[PDB]
Amino acid sequence: IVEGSDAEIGMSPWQVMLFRKSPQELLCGASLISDRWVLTAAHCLLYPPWDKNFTENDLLVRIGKHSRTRYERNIEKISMLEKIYIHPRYNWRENLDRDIALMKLKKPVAFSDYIHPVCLPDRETAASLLQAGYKGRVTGWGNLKETWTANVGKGQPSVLQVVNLPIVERPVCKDSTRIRITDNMFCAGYKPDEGKRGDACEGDSGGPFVMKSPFNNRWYQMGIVSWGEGCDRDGKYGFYTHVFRLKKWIQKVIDQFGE
């Protein structure tokens, strides 16, 4: 998260951590949506051009975290996976279209002041909240800067970083990129007129992008952290997998399957 701010304890009890067993390392973000179902970008688990094709017995989900490196005992909770469901039409060759994946915990997770599920929107929440100009929030432990040869400081978060970013209008997203945009992917970030800055970044993929509904005081996941060109660069924005669009699939996989 570029130019973000440190979170607070229990500020996003749904942010999960994709942890690789060996080497031991931070894979990406995720989201507890049910006591036994987590959510993630498809590319954290699948990426032929880089040899990623993880199996469940190759990963760990750490919930309750806040510290990137420590091992917050009796606070966090580590869970093992039972199956990995990726979107059949996941398109890795050109633009990570349909960049979404569902993980099923070998066993259920209990809730505490730090482990709470996030809500998945409906057409009406999507309609009211998903609008150009409104602000959603992104949190994650990935890079603080875009890998630059000349940047001093070998930096990556001490603790869970958080940033609020506005939704931009689809035409603006499209004219900024030469990558083929798609209905299943939106963009956020300040525009060159605002002057400001902030962004998600390497390591942040798979992370939630939530919004709070003022009609019910409830947190809703509107997007998943996905891709971009560079991190925090001029006249550029970041892209999130439209969660509501692919929402039929999610539930298709969830309802009578892993219950």
Binding site: K21, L60, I78
Partner: peptide, 11 residues
């Protein structure tokens, strides 16, 4: 790196 974790979380 990361603080080692309970070995059990590798079964």
């Amino acid at each position: 790196d990361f603080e080692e974790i309970p070995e059990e979380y590798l079964q």
